[PDB]
């Protein structure tokens, strides 16, 4: 996945820019990790970005 | 006669009987029209208009636009 279930981080779109500068469309995906979470009392998977995982916005 | 706002002076059951009688009269008129009778063609529309009037009165009573007798 490339969308964070927390903070809704989503891919950006930009350019491959070679030495000749012949720009080509490309994507920057967020570092989405699928981890086990225990929310309230629910065990389930969630696709969580590493930024949220580092900030602790996700309960494991 | 073609019926008017004096239908509001009647009761629900007799208004429904009026509906049934009007429907039967329209049935007879349609049969006459099919069979070649019924010189009086305007009644064939006026009976439907009367049915419309009676339903109008019944529905206003049912919806409490006019207080039910």
């Amino acid at each position: 996945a490339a969308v964070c279930d927390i903070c809704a981080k989503r891919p950006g779109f930009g350019h491959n820019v070679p030495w000749s500068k012949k720009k080509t469309n490309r994507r920057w995906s967020p570092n989405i990790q699928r981890v086990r979470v225990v929310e309230n009392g629910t065990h389930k998977r969630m696709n969580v970005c590493t930024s949220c995982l580092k900030a602790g916005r996700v309960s494991r | 006669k073609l019926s008017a706002a004096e239908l509001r002076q009647l009761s629900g059951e007799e208004l429904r009987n009026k509906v049934r009688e009007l429907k039967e009269e329209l049935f007879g008129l349609r049969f006459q029209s099919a069979t070649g009778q019924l010189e009086n063609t305007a009644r064939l529309r006026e009976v439907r208009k009367d049915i419309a009037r009676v339903y109008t009165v019944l529905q206003e009573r049912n919806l409490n636009i006019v207080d039910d007798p």
């Binding site: - | 429907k23 039967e24 349609r30 049969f31 099919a34 069979t35």
Partner: protein
């Protein structure tokens, strides 16, 4: 509920033609009926209207004729007609 439903709403008009009059010899009556009425409903309606025992009801759907005029093609309404067979002596007066 408003809008009392009368059995005479289903039976619209009788069919008058040479075939219908020939079928009258067999106690058979051809009526133009409401196109959404089934054989049982037509049978019950005829019984209630005429006080007549009905042995059989046969229905067909007849397509309306299409005629090309000024303003293009016109199409006459579709009709359903019930062919009602009456008991031996009951008879129905269509005038």
């Amino acid at each position: 509920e408003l809008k009392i439903r009368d059995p005479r709403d289903i039976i619209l008009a009788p069919v008058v033609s040479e075939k219908s009059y020939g079928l009258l010899d067999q106690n058979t009556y051809t009526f133009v009926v409401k196109p959404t009425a089934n054989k049982t409903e037509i049978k019950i309606a005829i019984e209630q209207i005429f006080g007549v025992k009905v042995t059989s009801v046969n229905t067909m759907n007849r397509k309306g004729k299409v005629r090309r005029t000024r303003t293009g093609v016109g199409k006459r309404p579709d009709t359903k007609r019930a062919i009602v067979t009456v008991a031996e002596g009951d008879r129905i007066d269509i005038f």
